[PDB]
Design a protein around this ligand. Structure first.
Ligand SMILES: NC(=O)c1ccc[n+]([C@@H]2O[C@H](COP(=O)([O-])OP(=O)(O)OC[C@H]3O[C@@H](n4cnc5c(N)ncnc54)[C@H](OP(=O)(O)O)[C@@H]3O)[C@@H](O)[C@H]2O)c1
Ligand SMILES: CC(=C\c1ccccc1)/C=C1/SC(=S)N(CC(=O)O)C1=O
Length: 318
């Protein structure tokens, strides 16, 4: 039986430092994966409207509660608002659909998924006549305002952001009449993209960081063979064997020792268990410095090249 360390948020709520990622987890597999994760000791699940698997995640959560395998109060469920729903009435609708699918009465954290607003309508990925993303009417500051109302009504415990640069976080914090501060910024992070400056900034403002794609998202559709590959990095593997651990476990531990929340995804039962077995070893200061030195400023997940729209996050240095 396993328990992930708590990272305290600015609201005093406790966020498990390891959670389960659910992106690309297919229907027919994610239910069992969540069941396995909960049995193994995971209490933090990372979800999203756009992953379109939340109802299956909801079933597994409900069945485990009925089973008395776990209590709601000890689960930590995160989902995300997709940018085609930034317009106020759509925030509540998308949120409601997420909450129904998940079979919950509240979410622990609700994130802005991506800072650029997209055209509303039936398409989740609106493009023009070329494959160019079409922007929306509402900005992420508009969406936030509607999201704050969710917190006022007890439906969500805390808010956060995903894929924000420090400029965009600045914009959020400086917003007039801000009711709630983000408790986390969820961003890609791993040894090829160390986010030293972004992490430094977020921490200085009492904002935690959640590391996504910590294994380098090998199952991402657009992966190319020549693309750098963290799980096969001989230097990572060599630090692993010294601790009698797998590479995946080092990659996960790396975030833990920087106090960064981390959410590796798997639908494979043995890997789900292996991924939370990371509290029984410690990387030395030297080993941490070596891994930090692998930074390549490489983004595994950067399929959105919508730099024509305002608030493209990745043009900024951090
Ligand atoms: N914009 C955003 O906010 C955003 C973007 C991307 C991801 N995320 C979140 O972060 C989560 C994690 O990122 P990600 O899904 O991109 O990828 P990732 O967790 O870095 O890697 C997932 C891949 O690694 C494999 N894997 C898992 N554990 C392994 C192990 N112990 N040994 C070997 N292979 C292993 C998985 O295989 P199997 O599943 O087949 O075992 C899957 O192919 C996502 O699921 C999502 O919740 C958020
Ligand atoms: C191309 C579509 C996108 S935009 C985006 S962020 N992601 C990752 C995620 O949703 O977590 C995508 O796969």
């Amino acid at each position: 039986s396993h328990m992930a360390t708590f990272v305290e948020l600015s609201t005093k709520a406790k966020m498990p430092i390891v959670g389960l990622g659910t992106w690309k987890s297919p229907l027919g597999k994610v239910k069992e994966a969540v069941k396995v994760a909960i049995d193994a000791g995971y209490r933090h699940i990372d979800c999203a409207y756009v992953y379109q698997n939340e109802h299956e995640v909801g079933e597994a959560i409900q069945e485990k509660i009925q089973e008395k395998a776990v209590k709601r109060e000890d689960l930590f469920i995160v989902s995300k608002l997709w940018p085609t729903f930034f317009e106020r009435p759509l925030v509540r609708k998308a949120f409601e659909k997420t909450l129904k699918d998940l079979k919950l009465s509240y979410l622990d954290v609700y994130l802005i998924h991506w800072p650029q607003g997209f055209k509303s309508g039936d398409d989740l990925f609106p493009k023009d006549d070329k494959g160019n993303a079409i922007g929306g009417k509402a900005t992420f500051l508009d969406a936030w305002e509607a999201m704050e109302e969710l917190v006022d009504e007890g439906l969500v415990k805390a808010l956060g952001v995903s894929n924000f640069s420090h400029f965009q976080i600045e914009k959020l914090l400086n917003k007039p009449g801000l009711k709630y501060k983000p408790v986390t910024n969820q961003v890609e992070c791993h040894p090829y993209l160390t986010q030293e400056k972004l992490i430094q900034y977020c921490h200085s403002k009492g904002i935690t960081v959640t590391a996504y794609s910590p294994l380098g998202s090998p199952d991402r559709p657009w992966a190319k063979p020549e693309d750098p590959s963290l799980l096969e990095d001989p230097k990572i593997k060599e630090i692993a064997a010294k601790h009698k651990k797998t590479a995946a476990q080092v990659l996960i531990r790396f975030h833990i020792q920087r106090n960064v929340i981390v959410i590796p995804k798997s639908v494979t039962p043995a890997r789900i268990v292996e991924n939370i077995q990371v509290f029984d070893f410690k990387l030395s200061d030297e080993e941490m410095a070596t891994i930090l030195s692998f930074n390549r400023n490489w983004r595994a997940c950067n399929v959105l090249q919508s730099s024509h729209l305002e608030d493209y996050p990745f043009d900024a240095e951090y």
